[PDB]
Amino acid sequence: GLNGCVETGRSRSEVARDLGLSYTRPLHENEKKQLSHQAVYYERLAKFKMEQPEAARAMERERFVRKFSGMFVKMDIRSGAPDFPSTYRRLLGTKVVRWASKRHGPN
């Protein structure tokens, strides 16, 4: 389970998955806690939308109308730039005031 599949292109996490093996380093408290908090998102959500449809519907109104407000509605190469401040640095001083720096990550 340490090697990826060359022709398949699936990673080592994959072929390990398929052989039904787990190589997972021992975890500290951070990771166990984050993970355990993540697993349950759907139970929590299910219980929420069943038991309390109103609060849910309010928040949904927010999201829905929000999609129509805002900066971009359209998802194109511009909107869909994974890094906006980096690919357009030439906007950063004058036009675009959101970002103070062109680089927040490795690349």
Partner RNA sequence: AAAAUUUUAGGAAUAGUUAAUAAUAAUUUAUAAUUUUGAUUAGAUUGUUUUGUUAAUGCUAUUAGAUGGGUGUGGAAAAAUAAAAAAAA
* Exposure on the CB side of residue 37, measured as CA atoms within 13 A: 6
DSSP 8-state secondary structure symbol assigned to residue 98: S
Closest distance of CB 86 from Mg ion, Å: 6
Q: In this structure, which amino acid lies at residue 59?
A: M
Residue 93 as a binder of Mg ion (CB under 5 A): the answer is yes
- The rounded distance, in Å, linking the Cα atoms of 69 and 80 is 17
- Using rule CB under 7 A, residue 32 touches RNA: no
Give min distance, CB of 7 to RNA, in A.
20
Euclidean distance between the first and the last CA atom of the chain, given in angstroms as a whole number: 30
Residue 94 in contact with RNA, rule: CB under 7 A = yes
Near RNA in 58-77, by CB under 7 A: 59, 62-63, 68-69, 71-74, 76-77
Residue of 18, 31, 60, 83 that binds Mg ion (CB under 5 A): 83
